[PDB]
Amino acid sequence: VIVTRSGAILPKPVKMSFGLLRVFSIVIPFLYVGTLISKNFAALLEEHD
Amino acid sequence: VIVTRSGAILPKPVKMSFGLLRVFSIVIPFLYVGTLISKNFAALLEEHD
Amino acid sequence: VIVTRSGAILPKPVKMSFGLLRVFSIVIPFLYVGTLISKNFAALLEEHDIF
Amino acid sequence: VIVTRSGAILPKPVKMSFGLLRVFSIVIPFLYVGTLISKNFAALLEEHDI
Amino acid sequence: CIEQHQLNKERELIERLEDLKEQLAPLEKVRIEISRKAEKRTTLVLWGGLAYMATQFGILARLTWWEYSWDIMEPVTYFITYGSAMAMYAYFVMTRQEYVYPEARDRQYLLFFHKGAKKSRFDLEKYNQLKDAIAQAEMDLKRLRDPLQV
Amino acid sequence: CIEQHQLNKERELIERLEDLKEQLAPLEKVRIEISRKAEKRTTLVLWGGLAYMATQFGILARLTWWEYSWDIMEPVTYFITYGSAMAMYAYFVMTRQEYVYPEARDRQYLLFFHKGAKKSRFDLEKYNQLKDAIAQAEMDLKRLRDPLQVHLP
Amino acid sequence: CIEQHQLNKERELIERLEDLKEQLAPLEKVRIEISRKAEKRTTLVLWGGLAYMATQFGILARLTWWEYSWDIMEPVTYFITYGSAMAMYAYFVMTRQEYVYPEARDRQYLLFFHKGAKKSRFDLEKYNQLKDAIAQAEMDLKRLRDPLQVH
Amino acid sequence: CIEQHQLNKERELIERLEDLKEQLAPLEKVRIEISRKAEKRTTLVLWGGLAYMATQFGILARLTWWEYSWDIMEPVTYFITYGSAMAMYAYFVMTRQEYVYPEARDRQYLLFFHKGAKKSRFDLEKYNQLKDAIAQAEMDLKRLRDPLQVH
Amino acid sequence: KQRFMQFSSLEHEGEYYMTPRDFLFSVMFEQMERKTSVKKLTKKDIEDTLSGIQTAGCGSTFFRDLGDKGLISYTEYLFLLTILTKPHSGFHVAFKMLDTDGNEMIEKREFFKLQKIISKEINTTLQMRFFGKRGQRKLHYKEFRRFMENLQTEIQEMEFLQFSKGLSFMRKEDFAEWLLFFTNTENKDIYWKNVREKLSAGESISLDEFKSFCHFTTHLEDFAIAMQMFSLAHRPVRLAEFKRAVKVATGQELSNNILDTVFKIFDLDGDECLSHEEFLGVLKNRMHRGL
Amino acid sequence: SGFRDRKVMEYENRIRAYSTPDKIFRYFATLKVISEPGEAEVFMTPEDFVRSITPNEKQPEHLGLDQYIIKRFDGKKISQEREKFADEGSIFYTLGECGLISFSDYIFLTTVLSTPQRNFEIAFKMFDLNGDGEVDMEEFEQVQSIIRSQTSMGMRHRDRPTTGNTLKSGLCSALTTYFFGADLKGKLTIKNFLEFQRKLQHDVLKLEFERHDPVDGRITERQFGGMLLAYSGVQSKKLTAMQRQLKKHFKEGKGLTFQEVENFFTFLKNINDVDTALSFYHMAGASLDKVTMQQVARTVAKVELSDHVCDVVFALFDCDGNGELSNKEFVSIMKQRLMRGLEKPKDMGFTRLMQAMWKCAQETAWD
C-alpha cells in the first residue's frame, strides 16, 4: 500500500482542512439539540398521559 | 470510483420503482403478525401453566 | 459477479457433503459439553477451596 | 488463495518475534494502571466531594 | 502475407460470429427463462430475509412491553445475537466463503439457477462453450481492427 | 516517402486530439459546475449523517440519567441497534450493493450528479463519448511514440 | 529455409515443456500429500472454532437461565463480547493484517503447509521456481501459436 | 535498420539503467532511514491503541466489580460502544476511508512519513521520479529480452 | 486570639487580662485607633473583682455596671466568644458531663478544665460569681442559661444603642447598615443598591423586634431546611411563607419593615421573592464575624 | 462461606446500595396475589421488607427476581380468614392488607424511616394551613413529593407496576385505613405521626431482632455484634477481636434480651449529640470506661444499660484490644448503622462534581 508498483512513494493524503474544529463544532450543537428536543418530548408526553 | 480511466462519469444507478413503498409494505404486516403470535404464544403458555 | 467477462455463466457452486448435518451434529454435543462443564466445575469450586 | 496465478505456492507467513509472550505482557500493566486510577477516581470523588 | 490472410480472416470471422449467433438463439431462449425463475426465487429469498428481520423484531417487541419483562428477555435477546454470529461462522465453514450480502445472493442465485438447469436439461456445457468461442472471436475482431488503426 | 507519411499520420492523430480537446472545453465547464453543486449537496449529506448520529446520542444521554432510568431506555437501545442492521439489510434489498461508507458516498454523489444532469439538461452522452475518445487517442498515441517502436526520429 | 527451422524451434519448445512437466513429477507427490495433511489440520481448526463457540454458548446457557440469574452474568457477558473485539484488534497487530475469516484461514493453512515443509525438507523453493518456469513456457507457447499471426 | 537499433539501444539502455542506479545510490539510504523513523513511531501508536483498549477494559472492570453496580455502569458501557461507532463515522468524514486497520496504519504511516521527509528535507519528488524512470527502464529490458530471443 | 493581645488591659505574672469594657470594645468594634493599654495588676484588682461584683446588676446590665472592674483571661475571652458566636455548642451537655452524680450543679474545679476544651491562683469575676466568693456554691443550669440569655441580650442592647446613633430606635437603614457590618461581597454593591434606591429609609424600629431578629438568627439551620424545602418545591417565597418560616424557626413572629426590607435587599432577579440561600449566607457572614 | 453464596451476597449488596428502587421491590418481593377478575399484584412480606433493607442477607433461590410464591386469594374461592403474615398490632398489619406491603408502601416506609424527625417537624409546620403542623391529605401528598425527592432521587414510572399515580392511591389506603379514618376529613398531628414513625421503627427492629432465632430470647454475642455492625465493610477482624477479648471474660454464654438492645437503639437516637460529651471527655483526661459509659447514657438519654451490653460494645470498638475505646470511629459507625446506608443510592456523583467544577469555573470567572 505504502509503495507503488514502481516502489515509488505515494503522496500525502489530504486532511479535511480544519476538520477537527468542524467535527466537534457539529458534535456539540446536535448534542445540545438532542438534549433539548427530548426534554421537550418528555415535558409534553408527561402531560399527555 | 466516480469516473473511469477515461474520466468518463459513470452511469446513473438503478432504483426499483416505488421501492421504498415496496419495502415499507413488507416491514409492517410481518411485524404485526409476529406481534399477533406473541399473544398466541403467551396465552397458550399461560394456558398450559 | 454471476457472469464471466466472457459473457458466460460461472461454474457450479459447491457445498460440503453432509456438512449441514455436520453442523447440526457438532453444535449439539458441544452445547451439551458447555452445559456439563460448568456443573462439574462450580460444585467443584465450592467443594475444594474458597481462598 | 495460497496458490498464485502461475501455480506456484505463496511464501511462509511471518510471525513476529514471540508475540504471544509479549502482547500478553503488555495488556496486564496497562490494566493495572487503569484499575488503579479508577480506584483513585472514586476516592477523589469522595475527597473533592468532601 | 497479411492482406490475403486478413481478407480471409475478417470474412471468416464474421462467418464464425454469424454461425455462433445462429447456434446461440435456441440455448439463450432457454437461458432467459431459467435465469428469470432463478431471479424470482432469489428475490423471494431477499424479501423473506426482511420478513425474518421484521417478524423477529415484532415478536420481541410485544413481549417486553406488554406481557413479559425486558429483565427476563434480555438474555434470550443476547443469545439470538450470539447464535447469529455462530450462524455466520457456520455459513463460512459450510460455504468456504465469507457471509456477506451480495456474495450470499450470488451463491443462492447460482444454486437456484442450477436447479433449474437440472430441471430443464439445459446445455450449460454448450452455452458457456459458445460464449467462450464468441468471446474469442470478439477478441479476434478487436485485434483485427486495432492494427487497422495503425 | 516513409517519414513524411509517418509524421502525417502523427500530425493527423494529434490534431484530431486537438479538435476533440477543443470540443472538450465548453462542456467541461458545465460539468465542473454541476460537479461542485452536487458535491456541496453530498457534503451536506455526509455531515447530516453525523448530525443524526449526534442528536440520537443527545436524546439517549438525557433520557437515562435525568428523567428516565436505564431500565426504561435499555430495550429502546436494543431495538435501535437491531433496526440498524435491519435498515442496513433493507438498503441491500433496495439497491444491489452493501451499506459501505465510501461506496454509498460515491452512490449518493453520482445520484445527485444525475439529478443535476436532468435539471440542467446538458449533453452527458456526448460528454461520455467525447471523453472516451480523448483517452483512446491518448493511449494509442502512447503506443505510437515508443522509443522502442520508433516512428519519429 | 525458415519452415523446418521455426517448426524445430517450436518442437524444442514443446520438448522444453516436456522436460518441465517431467521434472515436476517426482516432486509433486510430496506436495500433494503435505497439502492433504495440512488440509485436515485446517479442517480440525475450523470445526474446532465452531466447537469453541458452541461451548462458550453452552456455558452461559447452563448458568444464566436456571442455574443462576441473568443480572449477575450480564457483566461477564459484556466483558466476553468486548474481549472478543480486543483479541481481534490484537490479531490485527500481532499479524499486521486484518482478521477476516477466509483470509485468516488461508494464513493458517499456509502456516501449516510451511510447518509440514520444514519437517519434509523437499526444496519447495526449487519446486515453485520450476512452477514459474513451466507457466512461463506455457505463455510462450500460447504467444508463439497465435492463430491470427502466421508462423 | 531495425536490429542494430535494438543492440546499440540495449547497451545504452542498460548503461542508462546503471546511471539511474548510481544516481539513486546516495539517496535511498536516507529513504530507509526515514522509513525507520516513521515506522517505529507508527508501531508505537498501534501498541498504544492496544494499550488504550486494555485500560478501557480495566477501568470498567474495577469501576463495576469493586465500586458500583453493573446497572449503574451498563449505560456508560453502552455509550462507549456507541461513541466508537460514532467516532469511526467521524473518521470517514475526515478522510474518505472505511477505517479498516491496514488502511488505518497505512494512512498513519503516510502521515508520519511525509512529516519525516519534510523535516529531513528529503527530495521525495526526485526520489519517486527517479524510481519511476528506473521501473520504466526495467520493464523495457524485460520486454527487450523476449522478442529479441523468442521473436 | 491575637485580638486578646490587641485588646489586653491588665498584667499579672505576665498574664494579659481584659476588662469587661475592653471586651465590649472587642465585640462592638473590630479594631480601633484606641491603644488598649496594659498596666500591672496590683492586689486591689482581686478586690476590684469583689467590689464590682458586690455592686453590679447580675443580668443584662452586668458589664455596663462593671466597666473596667473585672478580669477576663484569654481562655475566658475565647469562652465569651463561644457564647456570643456559638449557641448550643454544648451547654446542657457540659452540666450533664462535667459534674454529674445528681443534678446539673457544676463544681468550681471542673470550671477551668471547662474553659480550654469547649474553646477548641487568683480568680476572675466568673468563678467569683458562679460558685460564690471562693467556690462555696454550685452553678445552676437554668441560672446559667438565664446568664447566656441576658448576656447575649446585653450584647444586642449595646449594638442597638451604639448603632442607634443616639436615637431611641433603629431606623430601617440603621438596622440594615448594622446588618452589613460583616458583608464583603461583589454583589455588596448590589446589596447596598437597594439600600440607596429601593429603601423607604428611616422608619424607626424598636429594640424588642431587634431581639426577635437576633433570636431568629440563632435558630437558623431550621430556616435553612425550610428554604431547602422551598428549593425542592417551585412555590416562590412570598411574604406569608417567609413569615411562617420565621415562626417555625422560632415560635415567635415579628415586624413588617424588617421583613419587607429583607425582601427588598433579596429580590435579586426574582421579583417579590426571597434570595433565600443568599440571605442565609449574608447572615452567616454576619455570624462568623471573620474566619 | 460458599463462593456462590459470597457472590450472591456481593450482588445483593450491590442491589441494596445502587439499584433502582422499583427493581429492588421486584427483587425482594415473593408474593403475587391474584385479584381474580383483574390480575395479580406483587406484595412482599415484612421479612422480605427486612431483607430489602438489610445488607449481607439473602432470600432463597426460587424467589430471586420476579419469581413469586403465587397466592390466589380472592375470587370464587371462599376466603374467610386470609393469612395473617404480620402480627396484629404491627404497623404492617395496620396497612391495607392482613400483613402485606405494597410497592407504594415500600417507598413510603423508606421515606418515613430513613429521614430524621426534625425534617418532618419542619415539613408539617410549613404546609399545614396554620403553621402548626395540622395537615390534610393534599399537603401530605406535598410532603411525600418533597421527601421522595430526598433519598430515592432516581425514581421512575414504568406504569406497569405501582410506580404511577396508584402510588398516591396506596398512600390513600394508608390514610383511609389509619390516618384520616373513613371520611378523610380530619387532620393528623405532628405527634401522632412521630409516634407512628417510632412504632414503625420499633416493629422493624423487633423483626430484625427476630430473624436470628434468639434462643430463650437471647442472641449470641457474636451475632449481636454482627447485628450492631450491619452497615459496614468487613469488620470481621474486629468481630473476632471482640470475640477473643470476650473469650477472656466469662460472659459469652449469657445472651442478650430484646429489651436491652431496644434501650440501646433508643439511646442511639440521642447519641449523635454526645459526640460532644465523649469528645470533651477525651481532652479532660478521663478514660473511656464502661461504667462512665452507662452513667453518661443514663444521664443524657436516661435509658438503663446492663454491663454485659457495654462489655460487648466496648470490646467491639476498643482500640484493637488495648482496653480503650475510640471516639469518632465509633461515632461514624453508629451514624452508619443509624442511617442504614441511606445517602446517595444509585450514584451519579460525577454530576455533582461537574457542578462543582463549574462553580470553580464561576469562581475563576470572578477573576
Numbering used by the authors:
A (entry chain F), B (entry chain H): 48 to 96
C (entry chain D): 48 to 98
D (entry chain B): 48 to 97
E (entry chain G): 191 to 340
F (entry chain E): 191 to 343
G (entry chain C), H (entry chain A): 191 to 341
I (entry chain R): 87 to 206, 229 to 399
J (entry chain Q): 104 to 470
Wording from the paper:
The major class of particles (class 1) represents a blocked uniplex in which a heterodimer of MICU1 and MICU2 blocks the central ion conduction pore of a monomeric MCU-EMRE subcomplex. By C2 symmetry expansion, particles of this class were combined with those of class one and yielded the structure of a blocked uniplex at 4.6 Å resolution. In the blocked uniplex structure, MICU1 engages with the MCU-EMRE subcomplex at three major points of contact using its N- and C-terminal helices. Firstly, the α1 helix of MICU1 is oriented directly above the ion conduction pore with its N-terminus pointing toward the C-terminus of the EMRE helix. This would position the N-terminal poly-basic region of MICU1 within the proximity of the C-terminal poly-aspartate tail of EMRE, allowing for the formation of a putative salt-bridge network. Several basic residues from MICU1 are in close proximity and can potentially engage in electrostatic interactions with the MCU D-ring Asp261s, including K126 and R129 in α2 as well as the basic resides (R259, R261 and R263) in the loop between α7 and α8, which is disordered in the Ca2+-bound MICU1. Most notably, Lys126 is well positioned to point its side chain directly toward the center of the D-ring and block the channel filter. In the absence of Ca2+, MICU1 from the MICU1-MICU2 dimer engages in more extensive interactions with both EMRE and the MCU pore of the MCU-EMRE subcomplex, blocking the channel’s external entrance.
Mitochondrial calcium uptake is mediated by the mitochondrial calcium uniporter, a Ca2+-selective channel that is localized to the inner mitochondrial membrane. In humans, the uniporter functions as a holocomplex (referred to as uniplex henceforth) and consists of the pore-forming subunit MCU, an essential membrane-spanning subunit EMRE, and the gate-keeping subunits MICU1 and MICU2. The two-transmembrane (2-TM) MCU component forms a tetrameric channel pore and the single-TM EMRE becomes an integral part of the channel by forming a 1:1 stoichiometric subcomplex with MCU and renders the channel conductive. MICU1 and MICU2 are two paralogous EF-hand containing proteins that are localized to the mitochondrial intermembrane space (IMS) and function as gate-keepers by sensing the cytosolic Ca2+ concentration and, thereby, regulate MCU-EMRE channel activity.
